Amino acid sequence: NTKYNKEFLLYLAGFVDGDGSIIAQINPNQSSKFKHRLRLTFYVTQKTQRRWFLDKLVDEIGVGYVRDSGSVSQYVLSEIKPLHNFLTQLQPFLKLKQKQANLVLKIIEQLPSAKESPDKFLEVCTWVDQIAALNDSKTRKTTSETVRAVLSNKEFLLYLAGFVDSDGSIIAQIKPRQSNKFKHQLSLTFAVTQKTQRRWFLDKLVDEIGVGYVYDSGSVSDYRLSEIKPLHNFLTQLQPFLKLKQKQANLVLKIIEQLPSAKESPDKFLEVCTWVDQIAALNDSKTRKTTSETVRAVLDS
DNA sequence: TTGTTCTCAGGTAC
DNA sequence: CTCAGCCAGA
DNA sequence: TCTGGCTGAGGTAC
DNA sequence: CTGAGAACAA
Ligand SMILES: [Mn+2]
Ligand SMILES: [Mn+2]
Ligand SMILES: [Mn+2]
């Protein structure tokens, strides 16, 4: 029974809350006693270009494996005993998926007894229902009804870095604008996205951080922070703990520090725009229009 | 001239 | 993200 | 009859 | 997730 470091668990709870899954399934299975088999699985999903992160997870947790599904990969942990040991330690730090973890533990503990009685089995299946209801469930087919065809500041920053590495965004932008001396306005943004159903979580962010705002559009919400001074301070505290977006955070800090110098010279303004390009290059950028090359059309002004 | 607020939306990476 | 599923081994 | 390794995909929530 | 851009506020 491996005992995990708290700082590792704190960051991982954040990352799990963002991009991880705690899943309970009822597999139809003829060779099983009650014609169904229970499956409990912990997943962390991540783009394959970042599978080193998931490979590190296997080493750190000490069990489980990584699979590759084309463009995306997953760390997977299914083995019941290590799964129980792991989730028991992760769950005090989970914020969004804590109940799921607790229910999966409850299930694992009643497994022996749930395999000896149809009554017990069915009840355990309703707990699976509860986990699926807590999850962002979409394509669930087999339910328990189907079965009823039986006959401190640092701690906050570690967690937050995990959530940021998973569901957050560190954004640098060059926005075209005639009124600006160099016809462009630099823009820096820290963002955390979450479906509006869960904006209570983003509301907490505003409180614990002290600055920033929550915005809604369609059915998703963002926590955003754009003010240069608070952003510099915030990202200075955060970046030691980031693993996926640390380089972006440092580039944003380096940009902020050079804003004075950038706003006086045309060659330094361009140079800073190339730092913006670098951030976008590190991000999973898809719809970028204005690059530094665009700004290089300053060869008129 | 600049910083910032506020909302929307493309294309995946969950 | 969160399901769906098959197969080999004991 | 049970378990764990392994594969494929629908529909958003990033 | 990570862009876009119109408009308010200095
Ligand atoms: Mn998420
Ligand atoms: Mn992510
Ligand atoms: Mn995500």
Side-chain angles (χ1 to χ4, degrees), chain A residues 1-114 117-137 139-180 182-263 265-267 269-288 290-301:
Chain A
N1 260 0
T2 142
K3 210 291 195 64
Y4 301 109
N5 304 339
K6 179 163 163 172
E7 294 196 359
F8 158 84
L9 293 166
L10 246 7
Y11 172 96
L12 182 50
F15 201 97
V16 168
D17 275 343
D19 279 343
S21 296
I22 307 183
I23 294 170
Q25 303 177 73
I26 307 158
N27 304 161
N29 184 118
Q30 279 303 113
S31 71
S32 287
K33 189 162 180 282
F34 305 118
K35 304 315 188 186
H36 300 275
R37 187 268 273 255
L38 297 185
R39 201 80 194 249
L40 309 162
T41 319
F42 169 73
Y43 287 99
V44 178
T45 304
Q46 198 69 193
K47 198 183 188 171
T48 299
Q49 81 168 40
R50 292 189 289 278
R51 80 162 283 169
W52 60 263
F53 181 96
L54 308 170
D55 294 324
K56 181 122 73 63
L57 222 40
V58 172
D59 182 75
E60 289 174 332
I61 300 178
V63 57
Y65 58 95
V66 182
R67 63 123 165 204
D68 206 321
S69 273
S71 63
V72 177
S73 292
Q74 281 181 325
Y75 169 81
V76 191
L77 175 58
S78 272
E79 206 181 339
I80 290 297
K81 179 59 177 173
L83 182 60
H84 188 276
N85 179 52
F86 170 74
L87 290 181
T88 295
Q89 297 176 57
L90 193 63
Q91 72 78 34
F93 309 113
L94 292 173
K95 298 186 189 296
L96 301 181
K97 295 182 201 272
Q98 186 179 62
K99 304 177 172 177
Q100 290 98 310
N102 288 341
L103 289 166
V104 168
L105 294 166
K106 208 183 180 185
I107 293 176
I108 289 170
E109 288 156 11
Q110 294 309 132
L111 247 31
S113 70
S117 174
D119 293 346
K120 185 45 175 285
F121 186 80
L122 196 54
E123 181 197 25
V124 166
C125 291
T126 71
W127 300 346
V128 173
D129 290 346
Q130 296 177 237
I131 296 169
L134 288 169
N135 287 341
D136 285 343
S137 194
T139 65
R140 193 183 182 230
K141 182 190 307 185
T142 303
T143 81
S144 67
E145 276 291 272
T146 312
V147 180
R148 208 180 45 70
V150 285
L151 248 240
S152 183
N153 192 50
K154 180 168 172 164
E155 302 186 12
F156 166 77
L157 289 175
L158 282 160
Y159 173 93
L160 178 55
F163 203 89
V164 164
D165 273 340
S166 53
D167 278 354
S169 200
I170 294 185
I171 315 172
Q173 294 179 87
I174 306 143
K175 310 193 165 181
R177 193 204 226 162
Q178 294 307 342
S179 58
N180 286 287
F182 304 133
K183 300 299 178 170
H184 297 87
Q185 172 73 44
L186 286 183
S187 187
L188 306 164
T189 312
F190 169 69
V192 173
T193 310
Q194 201 67 194
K195 81 191 283 191
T196 297
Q197 174 174 303
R198 285 188 288 275
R199 82 160 263 171
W200 61 262
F201 172 94
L202 300 172
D203 294 333
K204 286 269 193 179
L205 257 50
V206 168
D207 297 333
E208 294 157 339
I209 296 189
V211 292
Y213 300 102
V214 173
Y215 301 101
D216 304 313
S217 195
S219 63
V220 336
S221 298
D222 285 355
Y223 166 86
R224 270 164 194 264
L225 176 62
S226 272
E227 305 150 74
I228 289 298
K229 239 218 310 82
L231 186 54
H232 177 274
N233 164 107
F234 170 70
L235 290 180
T236 301
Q237 302 196 230
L238 185 59
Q239 67 77 215
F241 310 112
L242 299 167
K243 300 180 183 197
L244 302 188
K245 298 168 197 279
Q246 198 180 57
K247 276 136 80 188
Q248 290 100 311
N250 292 136
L251 288 166
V252 165
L253 293 164
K254 183 187 181 191
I255 285 178
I256 291 176
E257 300 163 26
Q258 295 301 148
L259 275 180
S261 318
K263 288 142 63 177
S265 175
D267 287 308
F269 183 86
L270 180 63
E271 174 179 25
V272 171
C273 291
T274 75
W275 298 349
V276 182
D277 294 343
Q278 296 175 221
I279 291 174
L282 293 160
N283 290 353
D284 294 338
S285 166
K286 296 171 190 321
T287 61
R288 194 173 188 238
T290 307
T291 76
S292 71
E293 281 308 305
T294 317
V295 178
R296 184 174 257 93
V298 85
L299 305 186
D300 307 353
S301 166

